[PDB]
Amino acid sequence: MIVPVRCFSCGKVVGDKWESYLNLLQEDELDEGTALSRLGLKRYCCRRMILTHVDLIEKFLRYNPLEKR
């Protein structure tokens, strides 16, 4: 649901990169390959990890059991 700390196949940390990836993608017309290149991910094992993260925790958080709705 949330970005993993370490890439499964290798161990290169991709968990300090999700917000950076989103910012690079939205602020500029950066393609996903270019963003993953600029983010320190050159092997496809790391590249797919941030290319293919869903971030379902956003949909998960919108049901708060401790807040008036």
């Binding site: 989103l22 993608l25 939205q26 996903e32 290319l51 293919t52 869903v54 971030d55 379902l56 956003e58 949909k59 919108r62």
Partner: protein
């Protein structure tokens, strides 16, 4: 032209802010349309 695309920006946008207008994924509702339409046809539509 690219054949497909990870609509990651759209996915995060729809996670953060679900639409207030008509729901996205229109084809996900015509899938269930049989059951809903069956139930709605007994208490609505012509002759009551």
């Amino acid at each position: 032209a690219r054949t497909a695309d990870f609509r990651t920006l759209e996915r995060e946008s729809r996670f953060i802010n679900p639409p207030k207008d008509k729901s996205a994924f229109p084809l996900l509702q015509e899938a269930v349309q049989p059951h809903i339409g069956s139930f709605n046809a007994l208490t609505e539509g012509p002759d009551g």
